Amino acid sequence: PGKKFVARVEEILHDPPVARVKFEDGTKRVVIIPKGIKVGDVVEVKK
Amino acid sequence: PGKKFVARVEEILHDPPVARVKFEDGTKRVVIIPKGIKVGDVVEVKK
């Protein structure tokens, strides 16, 4: 299935979308999110 | 969907953008990234 991780969306980089998200421990990852996500959202993400 | 891969951005080559990224295992790939990415970021990339 995957592991349990929560991150917060800071900046969305849409350019015809990806998101820079901060995890629980200050880590920053830029992940692929579907169109509909906004900044400030909390998302569940794995490895 | 795609597989799970993490890479680190080393150099951005913007010239009117692409990025040289190192994966988990020292591999280097130059991928297409949207405008907003910076060097040192960790990005999720597939095949």
Author numbering:
A (entry chain A), B (entry chain A): 4 to 19, 24 to 54
Question: What's the paper's own text on this?
Answer:
Here, we study fold transition between distinct β-barrels by protein engineering and structural biology technique. Here, we discover that the previously reconstructed ancient DPBB sequence could also adopt a β-barrel fold named Double-Zeta β-barrel (DZBB), as a metamorphic protein. The DZBB fold is not found in any modern protein, although its structure shares similarities with RIFT and OB. Furthermore, the reconstructed OB fold could also be converted to the four-stranded SH3 fold by a simple circular permutation. Thus, these ancient β-barrel folds (DPBB, RIFT, OB, and SH3) could be readily interconverted by a few feasible mutations through the missing-link fold, DZBB, indicating their significantly close evolutionary relationships.
To examine what determines the DZBB–OB transition, additional intermediates have been engineered by sequential mutagenesis and experimental validation steps (design-12–17). The 2nd generation mutants, design-13 (tkoL2_v1.2) and design-16 (mkaL2_v1.2), have ~60% sequence identities with design-2 (DZBB-fold), and retained moderate thermostability. In these designs, only a short segment was from rL2 (segment 1: from the middle of β1 to the start of β3), and the other parts are from design-2. Helix α1 (segment 2) was also omitted. The crystallographic analysis revealed that design-13 still adopts the four-stranded OB fold, indicating that segment 1, but not segment 2, could serve as the determinant for the fold transition between the DZBB and OB structures. Only high concentrations of design-13 and -16 retarded the migration of dsDNA slightly. The acquisition of the weak DNA binding affinity of these two proteins may have resulted from additional lysine residues at the end of β3 and the 3rd loop, compared to other OB-fold chimeras.
